[PDB]
Design a binder for these strands. Structure first.
Ligand SMILES: [Ca+2]
Ligand SMILES: [Mg+2]
Length: 430
DNA sequence: ATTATGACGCT
DNA sequence: AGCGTCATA
């Protein structure tokens, strides 16, 4: 009744750069702009592996994870940009630096949580209150929301995309109660005005475009963001939830895309998020555990309480390289040489991190995969990280893994190694 | 022979 | 701690 929480206490946005690595390359090379293009890493094996795809290329069916040779079969005029190679491996520095550009702009508007290289959650609750005070009961013009979609509208009693967008928006604004500074729908609307402003600033100052979701929590924000891409933003209101979830496959919800989501579907015999409402919280907790059960019970009603964490910097800095099929490392000299390459990239990134961010990593995590193991990682071991020195780190890493060598010969490595990983963690202020 | 990342949960 | 899950370019 009057005591039933509705999860409308916050305004949260998720901003996500459109085909990010592609835009980075297109900014640098104007010849790639407005073309079907992709970003690829390496090149020898089947033309390279695609990691990002422009919307023009996606129309031909080009996807992430596709080999470039195969992509060219779908899209013969596909243009490509290659990821930089340093010390024998892919080097993502250019994209990490572009990311900082965007995050520093978003941080001017609100506290952000860096969710990935190209997305951040924004807690707009306080900013919306402020903006609402400046507004003085004054209505919000459709003009302040030029790229906004209202999920669920238009409805009820134009055949062009942009025209539908506007019809929906008009219905929404026609129905807003603006004299009420606590209306959740109004709050979301003002949130969308601010995100329009954030997105304009990002584009003006970087050249990069993005999409965004505006809702009452991170999960709905994230879902909303993907509803209208690219270069658009979507408002998912509390009210839109029942209809949106009634046909929303469970795997679409963040955290439900893997094994848990599959078990929810299998155990409960349902397909869609909204079907979850028919189970009690205790039923859900019985199948999926106490925490997941409570989470699912609230989430299928559009309610979620995870905070936007005040964190703009990554918590770890890592370097990894796969050594697939025949290239697997089978000698001690090999393993040592590659540990050094990885350690050298890591030292470089750690030193920059210390100068920029006033912190020092204190733990080195070492991880390898051995040929045969189905798991991505076969073994993880940590040691102390007392000095930013690549020779030291690679030596320490070899020490912690050197006994994974089954070989009776000192110089041979069996089973061969198909992945090496160095990660610096546990930062302290400096 | 996707690859290179990065966060957080479990015991 | 070391392992597994889930996610993104
Ligand atoms: Ca993106
Ligand atoms: Mg993303």
């Amino acid at each position: 009744g009057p005591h039933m929480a509705t999860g409308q206490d916050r305004v949260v946005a998720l901003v996500d750069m459109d085909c990010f690595f592609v835009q980075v390359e297109q900014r640098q090379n104007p010849h790639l702009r407005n073309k079907p293009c992709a970003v690829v890493q390496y090149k020898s094996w089947k033309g390279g592996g695609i990691i990002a795809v422009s919307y023009e290329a996606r129309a031909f069916g080009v996807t992430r994870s596709m080999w470039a040779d195969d992509a060219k079969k779908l899209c013969p005029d596909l243009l490509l940009a290659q990821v930089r190679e340093s010390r024998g491996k892919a080097n993502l520095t250019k994209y990490r630096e572009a990311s900082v550009e965007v995050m520093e702009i978003m941080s001017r508007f609100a506290v952000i949580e860096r969710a990935s290289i190209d997305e951040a959650y924004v807690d707009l609750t306080s900013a919306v209150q402020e903006r609402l005070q400046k507004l003085q009961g004054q209505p919000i013009s459709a003009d302040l929301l030029p790229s906004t979609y209202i999920e669920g509208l238009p409805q009820g009693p134009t055949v062009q995309k942009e025209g539908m967008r506007k019809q929906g928006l008009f219905q929404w604004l026609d129905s807003l109660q603006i004299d009420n500074l606590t209306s959740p729908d109004l709050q979301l609307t003002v949130g969308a005005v601010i995100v329009e402003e954030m997105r304009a600033a990002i584009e003006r100052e970087t050249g990069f475009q993005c999409s965004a979701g505006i809702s009452h929590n991170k999960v709905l924000a994230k879902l909303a963001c993907g509803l209208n891409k690219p270069n658009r933003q979507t408002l998912v209101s509390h009210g839109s939830v029942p209809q949106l979830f009634s046909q929303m496959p469970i795997r679409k919800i963040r955290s439900l895309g893997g094994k848990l989501g599959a078990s929810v579907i299998e155990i409960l015999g349902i397909e869609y998020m909204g079907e979850l409402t028919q189970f009690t919280e205790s039923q859900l907790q019985s199948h999926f555990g106490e925490k997941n059960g409570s989470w699912l019970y609230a989430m299928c009603r559009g309610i979620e309480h995870d905070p936007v964490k005040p964190r703009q910097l990554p918590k770890t800095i890592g370097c990894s390289k796969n050594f697939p099929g025949k290239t697997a490392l089978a000698t001690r000299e090999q393993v040592q040489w590659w540990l050094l390459q990885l350690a050298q990239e890591l030292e470089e990134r750690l030193t920059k991190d210390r100068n920029d961010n006033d912190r020092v990593a204190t733990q080195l995590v070492v991880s390898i995969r051995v040929q045969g193991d189905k798991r991505l990682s076969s073994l993880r071991r940590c040691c102390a990280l007392t000095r930013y020195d690549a020779h030291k780190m690679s030596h320490d890493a070899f020490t912690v893994i050197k006994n994974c060598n089954t070989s009776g010969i000192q110089t041979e490595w069996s089973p061969p190694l198909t992945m090496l990983f160095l990660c610096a963690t546990k930062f302290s202020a400096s």
